[PDB]
Write a protein that binds this ligand. Structure first.
Ligand SMILES: O=C1CC(I)=CC=N1
Length: 181
């Protein structure tokens, strides 16, 4: 409808795939080459389905901060025959708050879904499903089951991936440029 949705659509159309694990179907953001991200609670194994194609996982790393606290981001390298458009220059270099963000989801349950979530708070610490988690972004939208892995954008920046909600608020794990050097 506006330039927020324009940027979100450009990321969804070229940099997302549908990832299926034994824990469900997720929006999965491709960042560069064969490297993508997914919430750690997806429990990625040796094999994953990418757009319903059986795919070997060449490497997977559950990120933690230097306090050894969960970040809820897993970086995956896929045995895929095609590279992602390199979007690393759209990743923030620091923790920050944002105005006017969009949460974008693409699965069998939620095809071509775009949610204007509004202001995003650097929330920091969250007990997420009982796991202490750092670098959490918060938005005041009642997100639902099936939106995990959804991409959080502003105009010109890809700032996080949706990892949970409490029925009134939604929470994303930050994406930082330093994760993908
Ligand atoms: O919070 C929500 C999500 C959705 I999809 C529909 C209605 N409310």
């Amino acid at each position: 409808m506006g330039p927020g949705f324009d940027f979100a659509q450009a990321i969804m159309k070229k940099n997302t795939v549908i990832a299926r694990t034994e824990k469900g179907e997720f929006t999965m953001l491709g960042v560069y080459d064969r490297v993508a991200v997914i919430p750690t609670h997806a429990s990625v194994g040796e094999i994953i389905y990418i757009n319903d194609v059986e795919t070997r996982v060449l490497d997977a790393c559950a990120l933690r901060d230097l306090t050894d606290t969960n970040l809820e981001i897993t970086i995956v390298k896929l045995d895929r025959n095609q590279k992602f458009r390199d979007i690393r220059h759209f990743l923030p270099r620091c923790e920050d708050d944002y105005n006017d963000a969009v949460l974008s989801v693409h699965t069998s349950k939620f095809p071509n879904m775009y949610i204007p979530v509004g202001q995003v708070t650097n929330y920091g610490f969250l007990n997420l499903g009982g796991t202490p988690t750092h670098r959490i972004l918060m938005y005041n939208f009642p997100t639902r089951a099936g939106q995990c892995g959804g991409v959080v954008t502003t105009t010109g920046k890809v700032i996080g991936i949706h990892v949970g909600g409490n029925g009134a608020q939604g929470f994303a794990a930050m994406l930082l440029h330093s994760y993908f050097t």
